[PDB]
């Protein structure tokens, strides 16, 4: 299963990157694969929708009045635009907390454009600027709602992180021992499980959206998953920002799916049932997860866009909005194109 | 074969990177290896000392009076610091040329601290700020020295580029057809050849400097290689810049080797004869070349340092100057250590 994305200079191989991908149905049955579809994989921020679920199922969180844009921010790895920071502060007021209560730190923006502004300003990013700030405020919310004490909401012994750990395992349909945990850049526990289970999570998100839309009776959990899908698709700029893959991908598909970046080159997508999914051989929703073995983001976005093409998800029209991600520009300092990106991999079913 | 450098988060595999490496003696004989030591590889800026050789061997260049720091800038991927721009301009004045004669383009500095300062200032890098500006001024020089005309010094049909292609193949001991050619970021022809041959080039640099130091007869080309090594070793800040691996590596070793980065994560080192190289089983200078298959520079610097330590080159003292390249920091936004870097490969030897 030698599946690669490859860059060339004048047709000479520059770099090559090993690709893993899983394509699963709404129960997580594996439908297509690249590389090792069960690779044990840190999901990183691609697990944010499952953290958002653990927040939304925390009793009393409903009392704070978070809106859909708020929930989308809980699912986000945002670009620290002024609207993201403003929303972080506004969410903190809702729970009568302060920036001092966050246990996440500032960092250079995920948007080069934002970061340039910051440099010109000599702006020092603080906790509320964290790309994960929405998820931390959600967790603080949960901690206050159960009377747990906000100190250490971010540590594994805290009930808020016990709810995350349980929720992740449940969504993956794994025993607790089959999920491993480390600590992320924003100082939260972050899960590792087989790659296909990441796609299983996103298949469940889209499936719940399908059930909601069709008027089907739903469990509290399904209803909440459907609320999360709608939040992300309706406010995709909260999930990332202007110019960001996730935001442009989700705007292009106009509610048809959701997508989320995980750091070090993971990606997950949840596709509502359609002609395309039926053509692929399932009668429900579908889930896609991808990992680039070496962590290269640019190659990741190329592969995800190629993968959608090969699955016939969308249209040439929809997917063209992502063209600059699909075939990255390889132009030298004098305006000369010096190479390209190719995709020597083969989907197996 | 499957030789990897692996990052982890809490002991959980995060990313893994395939490593190719060749360690060769002064004639290119292969001594140790990782991965595919003959991987067809674009050498990128690791080829710039071969380009300086072609420059220095061009009829009439000697009369411009380039000095050792000038030659070091020819061999460089510099950080575009003010001193690199000043030396680029000084070199243009040696050949009576202008910035408008350069055929390379500006780019974000290879240095984050320089680049931040540019952004703070709204500075737009120009031709003269290119990391290869030294090489471009040397190819301009050679074209003017033989009356070839400054326009098009960068094109493959130009006798300056004809001389470069010839010099590269000769240093690799390869036939012309065994070298492939693309175009680089700085708009020059750039070569590709088996990875071990990049190490062969750098063993020749180190062997030439040994023979010059011992004062045996030397070809004009061996004399020129010994000069390139000396210039790189004496002005390593010109080869890269403050804080840069190549500068800190050559400084630490104090003339015992030269080292040079290739874009998309190739590396080459040339090692003078030593108690270490004699312990490695060869009676002369040594060449090391490395390619990280996926192009990660952070992983490259980590692996090269691990390689020197495994090979016994330097002392634990010398190499401790490279400690934060050997094991890159893995500390999150709150000061918590979240992971690390390991080197689960074994060097194979024959
Ligand atoms: Cl981290």
Numbering used by the authors:
A (entry chain B): 4 to 352
B (entry chain A): 4 to 353
Manuscript excerpt for this entry:
Asparaginases (EC 3.5.1.1), which split L-asparagine to L-aspartate and ammonia, are grouped into three unrelated structural classes: Class 1 (bacterial-type), Class 2 (plant-type), and Class 3 (Rhizobium etli-type). ReAV is a homodimer with an α/β protomeric fold, formed by two tightly packed domains. The active site of the enzyme is located in a cleft on the protomer surface and marked by a zinc ion with an unusual coordination sphere created by Cys135, Lys138, Cys189, and a water molecule. The conspicuous catalytic center of the enzyme comprises two Ser-Lys tandems (Ser48-Lys51 and Ser80-Lys263), centered around the curiously hydrated Ser48 residue and located in the close vicinity of the metal binding site.
The substitution of Lys138 with alanine caused significant structural rearrangements in the active site region. In the presence of the Lys138 mutation, the coordination site fell apart and is no longer accentuated by the metal cation. The absence of Lys138 affected the position and conformational states of Ser48 and Lys51 from the Ser48-Lys51 tandem, disrupting the H-bond network in the active site area, as well as the conformation of the cysteine residues from the zinc coordination sphere. In the four protein chains, the metal site was filled with a water molecule (w1) bound by the Sγ atoms of Cys135 and Cys189, and additionally, in protein chain C, alternative conformers of Cys135 and Cys189 form a direct Cys135-Cys189 disulfide bridge. The Ser48 side chain has a slightly different position depending on the protein chain, without the characteristic pattern of three closely-spaced water molecules. The absence of Lys138 evidently impaired the mutant’s ability to bind the Zn2+ cation. Interestingly, the collapse of the metal binding site did not abolish the L-asparaginase activity of the mutant protein completely, as 1.5% of the activity (in terms of kcat/KM) was still observed (vide supra). Moreover, as shown by ITC affinity studies, the K138A mutant is still able to bind the zinc ion, albeit with lower affinity (∼26 μM) than the WT protein (∼3 μM). The low zinc binding affinity explains the absence of the zinc ion in the crystal structure. 10 μM Zn2+ greatly improves the KM of ReAV K138A from 2.2 to 0.5 mM, making this mutant an excellent candidate for substrate co-crystallization experiments, and indeed for further optimization toward antileukemic properties.
